[PDB]
Swiss-Prot record, chain A:
Domain commentary: The MPN (JAB/Mov34) domain has structural similarity with deubiquitinating enzymes, but lacks the residues that would bind the catalytic metal ion.
Remaining remarks: Present with 468 molecules/cell in log phase SD medium.
Effect annotated for changing residue 21 to A: Alters protein folding. Severely impaired growth. Strongly reduced growth at 35 degrees Celsius
Name the UniProt record assigns to this protein: Pre-mRNA-splicing factor 8
Residues of the full protein shown: 1836 to 2069 of 2413
Function: Functions as a scaffold that mediates the ordered assembly of spliceosomal proteins and snRNAs. Required for association of BRR2 with the spliceosomal U5 snRNP, and the subsequent assembly of the U4/U6-U5 tri-snRNP complex. Functions as a scaffold that positions spliceosomal U2, U5 and U6 snRNAs at splice sites on pre-mRNA substrates, so that splicing can occur. Interacts with both the 5' and the 3' splice site, as well as the branch region. Has a role in branch site-3' splice site selection. Associates with the branch site-3' splice 3'-exon region. Also has a role in cell cycle.
Substitution effect: residue 104 to A: Reduced growth at 30 degrees Celsius. Strongly reduced growth at 16 degrees Celsius
Sequence segments annotated as region (RNase H homology domain): 7-237
Recorded consequence of changing residue 22 to N: Reduced growth at 30 degrees Celsius. Strongly reduced growth at 16 degrees Celsius
Localization annotation: Nucleus
Subunit comment: Component of the U4/U6-U5 tri-snRNP complex composed of the U4, U6 and U5 snRNAs and at least PRP3, PRP4, PRP6, PRP8, PRP18, PRP31, PRP38, SNU13, SNU23, SNU66, SNU114, SPP381, SMB1, SMD1, SMD2, SMD3, SMX2, SMX3, LSM2, LSM3, LSM4, LSM5, LSM6, LSM7, LSM8, BRR2 and DIB1.
Consequence of changing residue 22 to A: Reduced growth at 30 degrees Celsius. Strongly reduced growth at 16 degrees Celsius. Strongly reduced growth at 35 degrees Celsius
Curated annotation (Swiss-Prot), chain B:
Stated family: Belongs to the AAR2 family.
Protein name: A1 cistron-splicing factor AAR2
Highest taxon of the lineage: Eukaryota
Modifications the protein undergoes after translation, according to the UniProt entry: Phosphorylated on serine and tyrosine residues.
GO biological process: spliceosomal snRNP assembly; spliceosomal tri-snRNP complex assembly
Pfam families, per the entry: AAR2 (PF05282), AAR2_1st (PF20981)
Modified residues (Phosphoserine): 236
Gene3D superfamilies: 2.60.34.20, Aar2, C-terminal domain-like
The protein's assembly and partners: Heterodimer. Interacts with PRP8 (via RNase H homology domain and MPN domain), competing with BRR2 for the same binding site. Component of a U5 snRNP complex that contains at least the U5 snRNA, PRP8, SNU114, AAR2, SMB1, SMD1, SMD2, SMD3, SME1, SMX2 and SMX3, but is not a component of the U4/U6-U5 tri-snRNP complex.
């Protein structure tokens, strides 16, 4: 069934599972043509496939060539996502394959169920959680690899850096979703918070800065304030 | 014109014969139904006055034997049986006809309703769906489950309809996942028609039989089967022209015959709205769309 606030701890148990988010697969810029009509230009996208227990991120880069000559691209994008996730599962050793795949949008259920018919024991589930994974392209190193790709490509990351050496996966996911919610609500301010201290840097093999435990507490408080502030600016509270 | 004689009517019961029905009181001098048209399957069905639970009945074809109904007081139902002594059968049927103890199958001469509802239905195919090989007639009731239902529990008492499942390996070719799910033509034409049913007549026959079991017995699994066979055609972009024109006629007469008061439980809103207004064949069922919009505009 669906994943919600009540069965939340299931994410961090020892059954392999993956979240799949398709919000950045089909991306366009809208512009005016010489005749004054409107047209779209696709730009590179990505499937965001995340193991919430380990932080392993399977970032499948969707190159704009995959749309060439195709119709109904927003529909195709869901089936292309399902095709690539299915290929990833088949490429993994049996003992690494997920026992559940949770899709962040309900429109992915049928495309993924159909592409996974060969895996009847892998449960395909929706969620009632509003997760902020659309903001993945606000992480600079992820946006950079997507935009530079000249061909389809899979790139592997750990979205938690080395956090699990010091905190649990529950706490790491809470940190990640707070960071992404902040980047989604006000990208400029969130990035200012994350980078305004030159003395704290991002390791070459990391996505986020090398904050100490105490500094992460301050950063996390600043992101909460940002989200609350935007909430009031929005609603005039 | 053939006859289904009855030994007696010991319990009060509503008797159906095809789309007709009538009340028999407890111990009323009722000995059967005469003037039954030769050339069609027929169904004789029952609902006891004291327990409307369990409608039940028998599909039969009088060209295949001499059939009679006798009440069994142990099993508590009206049972169909075959009389193998043709002489005793004739002689008994005549006595009843002379004493006018039979109702006459009440077909109006202009009326092709029953033909139109059973056009492709053949006893030999009914007996493969309803397995009981030692009888030439077939028992169905309200509660019988289908083979597909049993997968999701007595197999000898099941309805062996052809399993249709849109999210199944059978329905989806590897590498054509999107194509085959959104346009089911492969599954309809290659898997079902060429592969399993062999021709459209057998497909329509099972469709018509499923509808009739849904309508006469309120059999839920039969209603699921009817809707699935409609939706598979409507969700296919490539269907023979003669099949679409015939489907429109089949459905028109089914919708025409359905009781107005039973439409809330025998018609699936999602399937009909999809078929008439969203699907590939949304503009191919003119007669069915017109009767649906005038008779059941609430459902739509
Ligand atoms: N005896 C005998 C057969 C019998 O009881 N029947 C009564 C009405 S139905 C066909 C003859």
């Amino acid at each position: 069934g669906a994943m919600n606030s009540s069965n939340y701890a299931e994410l961090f148990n020892n059954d392999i599972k993956l979240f799949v988010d398709d919000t950045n697969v089909y991306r366009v810029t809208v512009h005016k043509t010489f005749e004054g009509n409107v047209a779209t230009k696709a730009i590179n996208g990505c499937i965001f496939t995340l193991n919430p227990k380990t932080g392993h991120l399977f970032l499948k880069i969707i190159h704009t060539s995959v749309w060439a000559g195709q119709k109904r691209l927003s529909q195709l994008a869901k089936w292309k996502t399902a095709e690539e996730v299915s290929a990833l599962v088949r490429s993994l050793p049996k003992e690494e394959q997920p026992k559940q795949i949770i899709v962040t949008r309900k429109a992915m259920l049928d495309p993924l169920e159909v592409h996974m018919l060969d895996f009847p024991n892998i449960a395909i589930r929706p969620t009632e959680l509003r997760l902020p994974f659309s903001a993945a392209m606000s992480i600079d190193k992820l946006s950079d690899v997507v935009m530079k790709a000249t061909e389809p490509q899979m790139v592997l990351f750990n979205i938690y850096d080395d956090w699990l050496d010091r905190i649990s996966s529950y706490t790491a996911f809470s940190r990640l979703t707070l960071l992404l919610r902040a980047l989604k609500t006000n990208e400029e301010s969130a990035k200012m918070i994350l980078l305004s201290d030159p003395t704290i840097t991002i390791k070459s093999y990391h996505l986020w800065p090398s904050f100490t435990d105490e500094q992460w507490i301050t950063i996390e408080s600043q992101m909460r304030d940002l989200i609350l502030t935007e909430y009031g600016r929005k609603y005039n509270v | 014109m053939n006859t289904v004689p009855f030994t007696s009517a010991p319990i009060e019961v509503t008797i159906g014969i095809d789309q007709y029905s009538f009340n028999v009181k407890e111990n009323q001098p009722f000995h059967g139904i005469k003037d039954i048209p030769i050339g069609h399957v027929h169904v004789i069905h029952f609902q006891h006055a004291d327990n409307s639970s369990m409608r039940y009945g028998y599909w039969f074809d009088c060209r295949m034997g001499n059939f009679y109904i006798q009440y069994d007081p142990k099993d508590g139902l009206y049972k169909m049986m075959e009389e193998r002594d043709g002489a005793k059968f004739e002689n008994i049927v005549h006595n009843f006809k002379e004493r006018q103890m039979m109702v006459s199958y009440p077909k109006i001469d202009e009326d092709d309703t029953w033909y139109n509802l059973t056009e492709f239905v053949q006893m030999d195919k009914i007996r493969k769906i309803v397995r009981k090989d030692e009888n030439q007639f077939s028992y169905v009731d309200s509660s019988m489950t289908t083979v597909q239902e049993n997968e999701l529990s007595d197999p000898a008492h099941s309805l062996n309809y052809t399993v249709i499942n849109f999210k199944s390996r059978e329905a989806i070719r590897p590498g054509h996942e999107m194509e085959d799910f959104l346009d089911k033509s492969y599954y309809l034409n290659t898997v079902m028609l060429q592969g399993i049913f062999k021709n459209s007549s057998n497909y329509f026959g099972e469709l018509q039989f499923a509808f009739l079991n849904a309508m006469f017995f309120g059999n839920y699994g039969s209603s699921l089967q009817w809707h699935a066979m409609i939706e598979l055609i409507c969700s296919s972009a490539t269907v023979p022209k003669h099949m679409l024109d015939k489907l429109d006629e089949i459905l028109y007469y089914q919708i025409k015959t359905l009781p107005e008061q039973y439409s809330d439980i025998l018609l699936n809103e999602r399937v009909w709205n999809i078929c008439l207004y969203s699907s590939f064949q949304k503009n191919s069922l003119h007669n069915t769309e017109k009767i649906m919009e005038n008779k059941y505009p609430e459902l739509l």
